[PDB]
Symmetry: C4
Subunit: 65 residues, 4 copies
């Protein structure tokens, strides 16, 4: 009957929500990789700050002639 | 059967709500995924910046 | 009916998935405020780069 | 019945999307760490600005 048509509609919308959940999960995964790169950026800027300090060190030597 | 029909309709309503949740969630993830290109561009500027410090570290010795 | 209790559990489980999705949506909305942060960062960096170069120019004149 | 087994199929598929949600929850939790990575970078760029101003101050003095 119309009950069987309905029961197959529930099954199919459940299968479609499952399939979109896999795509949402991939996009989350790809953002998590981007978190790894943002972590490396954090690390590179700290290394740059260490370097600016060397500059400043030599610049102090120049100022005292 | 009137009760089962009405309950089955509840399940279908509930699925349509979850389908709409999925679509709102997919939309916010696609807006976030724009960060990818911004982070690639930041990687390039950091490298450009590293180079520039070395040009500086050096000049500060030909002077010194 | 075992069938009635089954349909009730099915209803309860869906409403819980839907209630949990609301929390997922607000948290994701809260991450979109990062686009403004990361952009402010891109601008900061370009400005620092410019400055370092502006420093080399001054060094040449010394 | 044909029906009982179909309703079992629905329960199985429902368990799956509950499963999906747990995995979306755990990933999202991990992603939320990004806000703190971005805030840390902002602090680091502030400190860099300061350290550059110092350097220009010194080139100014010379």
């Amino acid at each position: 009957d119309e009950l069987f048509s309905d029961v197959q509609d529930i099954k199919t919308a459940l299968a479609k929500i499952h399939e979109d959940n896999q795509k949402i999960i991939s996009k989350l995964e790809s953002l998590l990789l981007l978190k790894g790169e943002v972590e490396s950026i954090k690390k590179q800027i700290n290394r740059q700050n260490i370097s600016i300090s060397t500059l400043e060190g030599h610049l102090s030597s120049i100022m005292i002639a």
